[PDB]
Design a protein around this ligand. Structure first.
Ligand code: HEM
Ligand SMILES: Nc1c(Br)cnc2ccccc12
Length: 289
């Protein structure tokens, strides 16, 4: 099972930069969402969830086919709340209907990270919408009530190693959990991409508590939370070392996250030898827009 990247006919960097800019301008405009967090974090969650269905063993799932647009995946309990991201992207897709769904969903995550002052994430076009019967079944995204061993094993399916896992989890500096979506509450309201996730893990006074949905979570005196899978990153000695590294090296974190996140978004895609090089989009700020 091979998914070959196919550039939307006639499109080049500038076409995609326009799509990036439209997302970025809407991000700036729609600032009220989720108690003024805005849509950046949910767009990053969306890009991860459309990608995180991938299975290296048979190359099913992944971002390529845009299958989040179909009911089965759209309604996955693991995707609760992502409908807000889909609705945000809908007018963008109406403006640029030439773009494939997988390209749009993944680009929305890239744009969100960058516009939230994160690292540049190189991005490649050419995901092709596939039919409804290619939609992966629910249950491929990870549980949050698990330990480090679960995390490590889960991410092997996505071909991610320890460093890649710890780096990817840094995205949890963004946004928050919502009890109605996932059965967890809290996380603050941060919408700037930093290494704060790791600093919070190492520096806060955490206490394990059972929330109003009957799930365990770690809560700090200062009002932050960690999922058990987040906290596992300081319980396992291998993960802890990497957590310390990123807490003490912002640039290293940025660079590792960028590589892991592009890899996450490209898992399952075969890029032909004469495919365009990855695009590095300018932010609105860099454009003076
Ligand atoms: C063990 C792996 C992971 C687990 C169990 C997990 C679990 C969760 C849960 C339960 C939420 C809260 C959803 C809600 O209540 O609205 C969440 C939110 C979020 N996740 Fe993860 N996640 C994982 C990995 C990742 C990765 C790899 C990324 C991206 C690189 C990511 C990015 C996000 C973002 C940005 C949010 C905030 C969304 C918002 O504010 O609406 N997560 N995650
Ligand atoms: N802000 C977060 C922190 Br801090 C820790 N874990 C999270 C998991 C999901 C969403 C947000 C967070």
């Amino acid at each position: 099972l091979v998914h070959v990247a196919s550039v939307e006919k006639g499109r080049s960097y500038e076409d995609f930069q326009k799509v990036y800019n439209a997302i970025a301008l809407k991000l700036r405009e729609d600032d009220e969402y989720d108690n003024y967090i805005g849509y950046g974090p949910v767009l990053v969650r969306l890009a991860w969830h459309i990608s995180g269905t991938w299975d290296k063993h048979d190359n099913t799932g992944g971002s390529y086919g845009g299958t989040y647009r179909f009911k089965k995946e759209f309604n996955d309990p693991s995707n609760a709340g992502l409908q807000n991201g889909f609705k945000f992207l809908e007018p963008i897709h109406k403006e640029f209907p030439w773009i494939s769904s997988g390209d749009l969903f993944s680009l929305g995550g890239v744009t969100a990270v960058q516009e939230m002052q994160g690292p540049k994430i190189p991005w490649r076009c050419g995901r092709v919408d596939t039919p409804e019967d290619t939609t992966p079944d629910n249950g491929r995204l990870p549980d949050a009530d698990k330990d480090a061993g679960y995390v490590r094993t889960f991410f092997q399916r996505l071909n991610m190693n320890d460093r890649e896992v710890v780096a990817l989890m840094g995205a949890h500096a963004l946004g928050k959990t919502h009890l109605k979506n996932s059965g967890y509450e809290g996380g603050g309201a941060n919408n700037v991409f930093t290494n704060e996730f790791y600093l919070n893990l190492l520096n806060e006074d955490w206490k394990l508590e059972k929330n109003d949905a009957n799930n365990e979570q770690w809560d700090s005196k200062s009002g932050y939370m960690m999922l058990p899978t987040d906290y596992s990153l300081i319980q396992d000695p291998k993960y802890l070392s990497i957590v310390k590294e990123y807490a003490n090296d912002q640039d290293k974190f940025f660079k590792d996250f960028s590589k892991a996140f592009e890899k996450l978004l490209e898992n399952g895609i075969t890029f032909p030898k004469d495919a365009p090089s990855p695009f590095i989009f300018k932010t609105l700020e860099e454009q003076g827009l």
